[PDB]
């Protein structure tokens, strides 16, 4: 679920999902169009594609379970949708952590009109 993803993001990066990732660049928190602005935005682009791979799942609300094995995120077995959603969120959280070194506050609340053109998953 969105709330669980937010907690995962905070655990991983030390930033609050809202507002650090909820409105960042062209794809974070409200995906869609344009060339991702930086590596963090690309994390969101891929995460959007990942959710897009699951048209008959409901990643905003469906809850999954996961644990930490010394640092590592381990998605525990739930329904097929839950497992797949968890893997999408895990990847994004890791991606955000891997790209904290470039994260730029100037991309928070990035305006829609600067995001133009479709980029294929």
């Amino acid at each position: 679920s969105l709330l669980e993803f937010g907690k995962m993001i905070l655990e991983e990066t030390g930033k609050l999902a809202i507002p650090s990732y909820s409105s960042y660049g062209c794809y974070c928190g409200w995906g869609g169009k344009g060339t991702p602005k930086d590596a963090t935005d690309r994390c969101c682009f891929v995460h959007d594609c990942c959710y897009g791979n699951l048209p008959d799942c409901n990643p905003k609300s469906d809850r999954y379970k996961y644990k930490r094995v010394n640092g590592a995120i381990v998605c525990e077995k739930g329904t097929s949708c839950e497992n797949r959603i968890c893997e999408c969120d895990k990847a994004a959280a890791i991606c955000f952590r891997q790209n904290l070194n470039t994260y730029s506050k100037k991309y928070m609340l990035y305006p829609d009109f600067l995001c133009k053109g479709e980029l294929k998953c």
């Binding site: 794809y27 995906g31 959007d48 990942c50 959710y51 990643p59």
Partner: peptide, 4 residues
């Protein structure tokens, strides 16, 4: 919200 939308797309992801």
């Amino acid at each position: 919200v939308a797309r992801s």
